[PDB]
Amino acid sequence: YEPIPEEFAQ
Amino acid sequence: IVEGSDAEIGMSPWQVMLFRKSPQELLCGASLISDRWVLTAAHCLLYPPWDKNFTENDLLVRIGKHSRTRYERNIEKISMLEKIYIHPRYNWRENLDRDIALMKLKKPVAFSDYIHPVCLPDRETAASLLQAGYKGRVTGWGNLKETGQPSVLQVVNLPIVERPVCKDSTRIRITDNMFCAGYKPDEGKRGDACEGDSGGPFVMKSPFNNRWYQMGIVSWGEGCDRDGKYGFYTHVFRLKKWIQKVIDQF
Amino acid sequence: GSGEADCGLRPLFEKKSLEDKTERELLESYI
Ligand SMILES: N=C(N)c1ccc(CNC(=O)[C@@H]2CCCN2C(=O)[C@@H](CC2CCCCC2)NCC(=O)O)s1
């Protein structure tokens, strides 16, 4: 899977 | 999905992907029923036999996707979960009875050409469309065969099967809160949901008002696309009252 | 009513009066 932007990980 | 085909763009704007934060991986399918609520299978969140017991912060919902692995910039939308609600009488011990769960999004999602809610059936629509022989549509990025994976969302059209035939195909005790679908051994055509499609929507298009309704949820099966076997789905309308209750009080 | 108006109508199909590749297979089965 392609990395998800960091700001959603919070 | 086994023996299905690539869905076309915007064909299932309610299709949701349950993504795990770590390790980042596809966890289940789901569906958008309003701007704040997502529907899925309870076993996707809780299933002790495999030590599965996720919480709101372990997951992310990805709406408006087509590709399974790519981050479809400017198209898909990622949302966090505010609260999760598993049906109080979900039976993971015996037969996955009442395999359903609602997830509340932290913030409302904005609709678009690739993001739109499916309708929830009412008594009249369920009585009219839930009949053996009537075909429904299942979608998901699950496995292509029994265990490999697809690059884009897969879709397959399957007929609902008579309750008796569903009952005589397994030793698992089936209940009124579920139904099965698939082609019989001598119908030639084949197809089925599979591992990874869990929580995905089983929908039907009403010939009366042209709207798409979600009649079921991918629940369980024994293998994938095995002759004489059928996929089982959670009967959405049967649990509509619990769904309404949760939404009106929370 | 039992469903928020606008649900079930896809922006790229029903709303433009266009049909998808196999939706006809479903409707033909609704006898
Ligand atoms: N052929 C199908 N339509 C589908 C196959 C697998 C689906 C995903 N569900 C599941 O994997 C659920 C979650 C808990 C175990 N599940 C299963 O489907 C189990 C059967 C289940 C029956 C109720 C009591 C617990 C055991 N079969 C696994 C298999 O055959 O691969 S849908």
Chain C residues inside the 8 Å CB shell of B206: 8
How many domains does chain C fold into? 1
What is the C-alpha to C-alpha distance for residues B148 and B115, in angstroms, rounded to an integer?
A: 27
CB neighbourhood size of B250 (10 A): 11
User: Residue B23: is the preceding peptide bond cis (ω within 30°)?
Assistant: yes
Residue B128 bears catalytic tag: no
CATH code where residue C5 lies: 4.10.140.10
DSSP C26: H
DSSP state of B218: E
**Distance from C-alpha of B61 to C-alpha of B77, rounded to nearest angstrom:** 8
Q: Is B99 a catalytic residue?
A: yes
Residue C21 domain boundaries: 1-31
Cβ-defined contacts of B165-168 (< 8 Å, 24+): B165/B230, B166/B230, B166/B232
Nearest CA to ligand 1 atom 2: B221
**B109: phi then psi, degrees, rounded to nearest 5:** -100, 140
Per-position DSSP letters for A1-10, written without gaps between them: -PPPPGGGT-
C19 with C12: CB under 8 angstroms? Answer: no
Q: What residues form DSSP beta bridges with B62?
A: B17, B78
For ligand 1, the distance from its centroid to the CA atom of residue B43, given in whole angstroms, is: 10
CA distance B57 to B20: 9
Q: Across the strands, what pairs with B135?
A: B159
Burial profile B74-105: b = 16 or more Cβ within 10 angstroms, e = fewer:
ebbbbbbbeebbbbeebebeebbbbbbbbbbb
Using a CB–CB cut-off of 8 Å, the residues of B that contact C are 8-11, 13, 33-34, 111-114, 116-122, 129, 133-137, 155, 157, 159, 204-207, 209-213
What does DSSP say about strands B201-205 and B178-181: parallel, antiparallel, or unpaired? unpaired
| Resolution (Å) of this entry | 2.4
DSSP string, B175-230: -TTEEEE---TTSS---B--TT-TT-EEEEE-TTT--EEEEEEEEE-SSSS-TT--
Domains of chain B with bracketed CATH: 1-12+118-237 (2.40.10.10), 13-117+238-250 (2.40.10.10)
